[PDB]
Amino acid sequence: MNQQKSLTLIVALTTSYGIGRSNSLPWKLKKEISYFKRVTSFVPTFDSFESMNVVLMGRKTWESIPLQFRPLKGRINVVITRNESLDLGNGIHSAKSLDHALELLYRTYGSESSVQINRIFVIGGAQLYKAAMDHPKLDRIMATIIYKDIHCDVFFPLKFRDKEWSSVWKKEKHSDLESWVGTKVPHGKINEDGFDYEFEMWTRDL
Ligand SMILES: NC(=O)c1ccc[n+]([C@@H]2O[C@H](COP(=O)([O-])OP(=O)(O)OC[C@H]3O[C@@H](n4cnc5c(N)ncnc54)[C@H](OP(=O)(O)O)[C@@H]3O)[C@@H](O)[C@H]2O)c1
Ligand SMILES: COc1ccc(OC)c(CN(C)c2ccc3nc(N)nc(N)c3c2)c1
């Protein structure tokens, strides 16, 4: 048991690929947070009482969510840490690597589980993003592009939107995005508190 399912990466980044500053988000986008919640939470109604999505995150990203928004609700949370000394959590799983987390979910949630897994999402940070980028099951990127050069100190590891990667990663039609996400999403740019941003979906053939 290891991988059958595809992986989906979800990120909010500037046109310079900046993803963060001083172990937090250098922007306050309340509607950007609501899209995240929605995307990472959505499960088809037919499958809504048995299934759930999984959110995989690096230990620094875990330390970043307000104590108040931990764990992410209605989703299975898995923290990747080598230094799993003692991860505190009443059913928050810890796994030492990306593949180590996949076999743990595959083990902990099989046919004999009252809880089934729908979608698997990598939600950050930079180091976990580097590992997912290299994983042979990663085929989709949900990106939020922020059209401002906001000073950042952590960058997204692969320039997926750049010409060097244009035969690999392709941006999908907005109707393709809303269908995957199962709901309707804002087309065009969104301005909220001085930042212009937009929602995109990139995919690659495995
Ligand atoms: N803009 C966005 O969408 C977005 C999304 C998420 C996060 N962020 C930001 O990204 C920054 C955090 O990024 P980061 O790179 O510093 O942290 P990160 O990936 O969240 O955390 C790194 C820690 O996670 C574990 N880890 C991650 N990848 C691992 C692997 N392949 N194998 C084993 N352990 C692994 C290790 O834990 P131990 O060292 O405990 O082993 C490593 O020190 C923060 O500024 C956060 O705000 C932005
Ligand atoms: C209540 O939840 C949070 C509140 C504050 C916060 O910041 C410090 C975070 C950090 N965090 C996981 C976050 C936020 C926005 C995101 N947007 C997109 N597109 N992709 C992500 N992987 C993402 C991740 C989470």
Side-chain angles (χ1 to χ4, degrees):
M1 300 270 69
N2 226 135
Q3 15 78 177
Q4 357 272 164
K5 247 161 194 74
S6 313
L7 300 187
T8 303
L9 185 158
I10 176 160
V11 60
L13 69 161
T14 70
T15 61
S16 290
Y17 293 88
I19 65 173
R21 182 69 192 322
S22 299
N23 199 229
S24 16
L25 296 170
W27 56 68
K28 86 230 169 152
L29 272 45
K30 216 208 86 278
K31 298 228 141 187
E32 204 291 320
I33 287 296
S34 324
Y35 166 80
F36 173 72
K37 169 177 69 238
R38 154 162 350 212
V39 168
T40 59
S41 294
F42 179 66
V43 172
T45 73
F46 181 88
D47 297 307
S48 293
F49 318 89
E50 70 266 24
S51 330
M52 303 193 124
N53 299 324
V54 176
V55 290
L56 317 164
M57 66 189 103
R59 168 220 128 208
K60 304 180 50 149
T61 300
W62 165 272
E63 291 178 345
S64 281
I65 306 167
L67 311 168
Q68 173 179 138
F69 306 108
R70 259 192 254 192
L72 304 182
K73 283 180 176 161
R75 287 159 288 186
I76 302 155
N77 303 216
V78 178
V79 182
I80 306 304
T81 175
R82 309 222 213 36
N83 267 56
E84 39 73 10
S85 320
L86 44 60
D87 173 53
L88 164 168
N90 311 73
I92 269 45
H93 312 283
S94 206
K96 70 194 183 197
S97 73
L98 185 51
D99 273 287
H100 273 270
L102 294 174
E103 79 187 342
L104 148 29
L105 300 159
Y106 285 152
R107 170 158 88 245
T108 314
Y109 303 97
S111 94
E112 178 272 88
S113 197
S114 185
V115 175
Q116 302 301 301
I117 281 190
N118 178 233
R119 291 181 174 160
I120 315 321
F121 292 95
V122 177
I123 78 173
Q127 300 171 24
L128 210 217
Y129 287 145
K130 302 200 33 187
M133 290 309 268
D134 281 335
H135 195 96
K137 313 273 27 199
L138 189 315
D139 71 322
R140 197 182 304 280
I141 295 180
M142 310 292 283
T144 296
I145 322 298
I146 301 153
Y147 293 104
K148 194 167 174 194
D149 209 332
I150 281 158
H151 184 233
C152 289
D153 52 27
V154 173
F155 297 78
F156 186 80
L158 188 155
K159 298 187 162 249
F160 72 89
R161 318 175 66 249
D162 296 10
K163 176 167 165 212
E164 48 192 341
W165 292 100
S166 68
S167 59
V168 182
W169 292 101
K170 302 285 180 180
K171 183 175 164 148
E172 296 295 351
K173 286 170 208 7
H174 183 100
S175 59
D176 288 340
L177 182 173
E178 282 158 7
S179 107
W180 199 88
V181 154
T183 95
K184 159 148 288 143
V185 187
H187 199 171
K189 72 169 187 180
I190 292 64
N191 164 96
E192 181 182 17
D193 303 3
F195 326 86
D196 271 320
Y197 63 85
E198 191 171 29
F199 306 121
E200 317 179 328
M201 185 166 72
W202 296 68
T203 73
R204 63 162 280 159
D205 305 325
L206 268 12

